[PDB]
Amino acid sequence: MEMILEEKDASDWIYRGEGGANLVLAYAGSSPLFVGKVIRIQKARRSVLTSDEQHLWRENNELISSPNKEVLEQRYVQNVIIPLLGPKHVDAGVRVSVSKEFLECVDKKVTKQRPLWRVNAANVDTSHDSALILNDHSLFDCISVEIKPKCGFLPTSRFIGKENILKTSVSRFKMHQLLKLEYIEISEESEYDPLDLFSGSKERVLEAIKALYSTPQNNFRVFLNGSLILGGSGESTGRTSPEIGYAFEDALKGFIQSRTECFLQLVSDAVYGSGVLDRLLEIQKLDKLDIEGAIHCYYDIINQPCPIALPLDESLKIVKEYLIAATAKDCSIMISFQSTNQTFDYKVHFIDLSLKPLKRMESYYKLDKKIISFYNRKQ
Amino acid sequence: MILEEKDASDWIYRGEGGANLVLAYAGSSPLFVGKVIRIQKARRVLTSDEQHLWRENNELISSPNKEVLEQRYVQNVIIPLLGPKHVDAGVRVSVSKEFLECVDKKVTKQRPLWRVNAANVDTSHDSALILNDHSLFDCISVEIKPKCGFLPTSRFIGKENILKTSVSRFKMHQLLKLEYIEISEESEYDPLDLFSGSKERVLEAIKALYSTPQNNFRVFLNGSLILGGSGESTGRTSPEIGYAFEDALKGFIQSEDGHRTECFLQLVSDAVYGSGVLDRLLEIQKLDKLDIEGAIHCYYDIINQPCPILSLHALPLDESLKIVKEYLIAATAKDCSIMISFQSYVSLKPTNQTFDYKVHFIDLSLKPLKRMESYYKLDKKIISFYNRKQKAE
Numbered sequence: 001m002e003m004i005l006e007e008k009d010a011s012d013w014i015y016r017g018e019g020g021a022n023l024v025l026a027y028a029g030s031s032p033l034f035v036g037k038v039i040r041i042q043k044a045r046r047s048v049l050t051s052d053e054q055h056l057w058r059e060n061n062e063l064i065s066s067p068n069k070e071v072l073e074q075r076y077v078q079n080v081i082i083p084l085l086g087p088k089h090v091d092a093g094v095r096v097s098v099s100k101e102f103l104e105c106v107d108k109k110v111t112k113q114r115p116l117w118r119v120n121a122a123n124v125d126t127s128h129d130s131a132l133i134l135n136d137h138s139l140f141d142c143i144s145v146e147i148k149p150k151c152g153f154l155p156t157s158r159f160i161g162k163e164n165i166l167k168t169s170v171s172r173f174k175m176h177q178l179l180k181l182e183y184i185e186i187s188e189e190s191e192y193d194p195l196d197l198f199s200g201s202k203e204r205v206l207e208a209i210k211a212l213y214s215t216p217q218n219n220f221r222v223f224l225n226g227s228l229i230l231g232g233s234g235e236s237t238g239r240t241s242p243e244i245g246y247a248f249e250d251a252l253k254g255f256i257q258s259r260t261e262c263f264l265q266l267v268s269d270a271v272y273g274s275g276v277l278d279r280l281l282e283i284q285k286l287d288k289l290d291i292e293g294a295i296h297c298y299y300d301i302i303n304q305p306c307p308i309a310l311p312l313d314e315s316l317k318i319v320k321e322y323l324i325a326a327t328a329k330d331c332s333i334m335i336s337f338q339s340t341n342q343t344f345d346y347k348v349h350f351i352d353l354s355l356k357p358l359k360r361m362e363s364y365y366k367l368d369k370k371i372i373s374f375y376n377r378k379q
Numbered sequence: 380m381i382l383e384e385k386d387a388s389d390w391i392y393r394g395e396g397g398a399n400l401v402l403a404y405a406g407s408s409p410l411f412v413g414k415v416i417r418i419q420k421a422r423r424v425l426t427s428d429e430q431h432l433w434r435e436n437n438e439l440i441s442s443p444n445k446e447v448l449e450q451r452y453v454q455n456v457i458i459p460l461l462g463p464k465h466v467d468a469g470v471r472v473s474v475s476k477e478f479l480e481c482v483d484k485k486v487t488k489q490r491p492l493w494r495v496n497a498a499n500v501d502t503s504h505d506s507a508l509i510l511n512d513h514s515l516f517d518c519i520s521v522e523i524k525p526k527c528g529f530l531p532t533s534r535f536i537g538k539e540n541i542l543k544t545s546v547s548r549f550k551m552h553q554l555l556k557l558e559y560i561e562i563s564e565e566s567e568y569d570p571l572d573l574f575s576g577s578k579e580r581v582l583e584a585i586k587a588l589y590s591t592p593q594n595n596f597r598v599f600l601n602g603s604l605i606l607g608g609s610g611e612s613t614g615r616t617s618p619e620i621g622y623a624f625e626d627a628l629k630g631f632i633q634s635e636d637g638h639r640t641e642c643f644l645q646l647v648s649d650a651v652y653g654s655g656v657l658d659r660l661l662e663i664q665k666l667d668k669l670d671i672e673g674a675i676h677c678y679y680d681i682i683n684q685p686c687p688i689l690s691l692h693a694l695p696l697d698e699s700l701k702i703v704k705e706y707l708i709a710a711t712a713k714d715c716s717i718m719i720s721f722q723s724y725v726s727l728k729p730t731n732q733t734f735d736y737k738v739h740f741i742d743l744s745l746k747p748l749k750r751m752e753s754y755y756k757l758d759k760k761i762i763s764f765y766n767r768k769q770k771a772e
């Protein structure tokens with residue numbers, strides 16, 4: 001809680017991964033303060049909330065009075081998310097102080113491990129004085145699996161227009177796959193279908209797990225003692241080629257007594273067993289009107305005119321619930337495994353339950369507009 | 380039929396861009412009254428590379444000359460994308476070498492000296508293009524050259540060029556243009572406003588275009604230029620310019636003197652925003668999906684050269700072809716104009732006056748494939764100069 005990480009300390013931390021908003025390094029020293037920990041550091045695109053955000057989240061006073069963005073994230077998870085999702089599998093993390101120069105040194109350090117396109121978009125935000133400390137979930141040999149399940153339900157909103165009726169039967173994930181191909185963000189369409197994974201059925205869960213393994217993209221990753229053996233490093237990756245499969249099968253040696261097929265069934269049973277996806281789904285379902293509905297409430301709230309009648313409090317609630325749901329739609333799950341009736345213990349943890357910026361309603365709408373219009377054109 | 384030498388005296392200078400000359404008809408023949416003629420300049424039918432690129436368009440590549448080439452381009456490529464209602468591929472008309480020479484000499488005097496320095500009419504062409512004169516509906520016609528109205532978000536923009544994601548191409552190009560004495564001041568016009576879709580920001584852009592028309596804003600009265608440059612960009616609207624124009628509106632707008640201009644702009648802003656013609660164009664501009672810094676790689680694959688500049692070079696050829704076609708189509712959309720005509724529909728708020736209005740796209744030229752390279756250079760020079768000035772602290 002007091003400490004300040006300094007420039008010398010930067011050498012204790014190694015590239016682990018990143019999303020669009022955060023860098024993650026695993027601790028590689030021997031100080032029991034950081035063994036089995038990762039550090040998550042915010043990137044700046046290449047304070048603290050707006051007035052609108054302050055009002056939107058007013059229900060939690062501590063939340064809206066957050067001194068910086070790390071505390072913000074911490075209280076968001078603690079004060080908003082954990083009450084809906086439960087504390088069993090969720091951890092808001094511990095804030096630690098960092099020196100500007102520790103950050104710059106860390107930024108300089110990991111550049112070469114990062115995907116080029118992530119580097120073009122962003123680096124660490126060296127203006128921050130805090131970072132967040134979390135338990136490394138790839139350490140229970142430990143086999144660790146990450147799933148980014150995305151949104152597991154179909155909109156049903158009275159506010160989806162005639163033209164966009166397909167939004168009602170095809171999943172957001174599937175339609176999005178078309179556009180990503182179009183923008184060269186992936187090479188193949190994914191096999192994974194979120195509706196299977198969230199379907200509650202054993203057969204369909206195993207089906208989705210096989211899909212994630214065939215085309216991991218940025219939705220599936222496996223770690224052995226914290227080292228990447230399947231999946232991308234900071235990005236989506238290509239289909240699992242026979243060569244990659246081969247390597248994965250070998251890497252499984254010792255952990256599984258036999259092996260890949262076994263692993264998938266093992267992953268599937270943990271998923272379907274923990275029923276951890278059910279609570280998540282209910283939170284994703286907080287998006288009750290779809291963006292095509294909620295966007296209207298957004299413009300009432302920032303008090304501009306619908307460019308596209310409820311009382312204020314109602315509009316606020318809808319938009320609030322929208323962002324909470326956006327958090328649930330984009331978070332990840334990590335499942336820790338530790339050793340025919342072979343038996344494995346497992347842990348499940350949610351990660352990346354980030355607070356989403358209110359400004360994003362506008363781009364949420366645009367992107368959604370783009371997904372469906374392009375999907376319609378293609379059919 | 381064929382326009383001959385004697386028929387040249389019957390067409391007068393109307394304007395030009397970098398690629399074409401346009402004369403309006405002033406004679407009596409029922410064929411050409413209310414029409415313009417558009418004549419390709421030669422900068423002193425398709426290349427092999429282009430024939431490869433547009434292979435999927437057999438009609439296009441079998442065009443017997445450039446005029447028919449442009450006709451089929453608009454018709455078979457653009458119109459399916461933009462729609463047919465506001466677009467005209469126009470009609471081919473035979474012309475004699477002598478007719479083209481006589482036209483060349485005649486209009487020289489009315490042309491910007493720098494246009495003359497760069498090119499004259501291509502007298503080698505046996506054919507020209509005829510279109511409806513959109514300045515003819517007392518008609519007030521306004522041309523808008525809106526340029527590119529969105530910011531790129533391409534994975535292929537390197538970190539040192541990241542400003543390209545926040546500042547419009549138009550705004551950044553202004554600094555460069557100033558530096559080359561191609562303009563006298565920064566335009567106040569912002570394409571993002573015009574393509575924003577918000578009624579407020581459209582008017583703001585119309586006002587901006589009135590203040591600094593450069594080559595983006597023209598107004599005609601019965602086909603006569605009353606605002607904007609002739610065959611080129613023009614300087615900021617002074618109070619003396621503003622006066623002559625307010626007066627020039629006397630009549631067309633029935634309103635207390637000194638207020639006709641602002642009523643005019645409100646009217647243009649309501650027609651543009653009313654018709655939503657710009658949303659369709661914007662999607663076509665958006666066919667530039669990877670920015671030039673993306674598409675350029677696909678371009679070297681296509682002309683079968685080693686890329687002087689991994690994911691992009693691994694694409695199936697069909698895909699690389701698609702991307703470059705879309706780039707050039709988008710380039711057409713980024714450089715085209717809209718002409719909105721007015722005849723005393725939109726309604727004035729002060730005086731209850733109503734106007735009929737017609738909208739037309741012009742200048743949907745086919746961009747040459749070889750230009751991918753110069754596009755890349757220009758883009759480079761634009762972002763690196765802009766970065767320079769920003770470093771200046």
Ligand SMILES: O=P(O)(O)O[C@H]1[C@@H](OP(=O)(O)O)[C@@H](OP(=O)(O)O)[C@@H](OP(=O)(O)O)[C@@H](OP(=O)(O)O)[C@@H]1OP(=O)(O)O
Nearest residue numbers: 018019020021022150218235236326327330352354356360
């Ligand atoms: O950069 P990506 O690997 O493509 O993932 C991003 C990213 O997700 P991350 O938390 O993993 O980084 C976005 O979140 P931000 O980092 O930009 O805040 C998220 O955006 P939203 O959660 O705001 O929607 C978006 O998701 P989506 O495309 O569904 O909008 C998108 O992820 P995908 O590749 O899964 O699409």
Ligand SMILES: O=P(O)(O)O[C@H]1[C@H](OP(=O)(O)O)[C@@H](OP(=O)(O)O)[C@H](OP(=O)(O)O)[C@@H](OP(=O)(O)O)[C@@H]1OP(=O)(O)O
Nearest residue numbers: 395396397398399552594611612710713714742744746750
């Ligand atoms: O000569 P300018 O008056 O400065 O205008 C030219 C334009 O000409 P037109 O609008 O008159 O057709 C060019 O097109 P070409 O005539 O040379 O084919 C065009 O070039 P591209 O469309 O091929 O890009 C260029 O546009 P840009 O600068 O965006 O490349 C644009 O110059 P402006 O910047 O003044 O519009």
Ligand SMILES: Nc1ncnc2c1ncn2[C@@H]1O[C@H](COP(=O)(O)OP(=O)(O)O)[C@@H](O)[C@H]1O
Nearest residue numbers: 017018019020021022024134135136137351352
């Ligand atoms: N607590 C953790 N334990 C182990 N690995 C983690 C942890 N948190 C994140 N990671 C890894 O780092 C990656 C990036 O973290 P994430 O919080 O998703 O970044 P962003 O907020 O930018 O999306 C994750 O996809 C995950 O693989």
Ligand SMILES: Nc1ncnc2c1ncn2[C@@H]1O[C@H](COP(=O)(O)OP(=O)(O)O)[C@@H](O)[C@H]1O
Nearest residue numbers: 394395396397398399401510511512513741742
């Ligand atoms: N159909 C038309 N009716 C009236 N004026 C036109 C028409 N087409 C072009 N013009 C005027 O002539 C100018 C030159 O035409 P354009 O096709 O843009 O040439 P370029 O291809 O060289 O840019 C235009 O900017 C416009 O002012």
Ligand SMILES: [Mg+2]
Nearest residue numbers: 019020330352
């Ligand atoms: Mg993430």
Ligand SMILES: [Mg+2]
Nearest residue numbers: 019021352354
């Ligand atoms: Mg995130």
Ligand SMILES: [Mg+2]
Nearest residue numbers: 395396716742
């Ligand atoms: Mg022009």
Ligand SMILES: [Mg+2]
Nearest residue numbers: 396398742744
């Ligand atoms: Mg042109």
Ligand SMILES: [Zn+2]
Nearest residue numbers: 676686688692
């Ligand atoms: Zn290349």
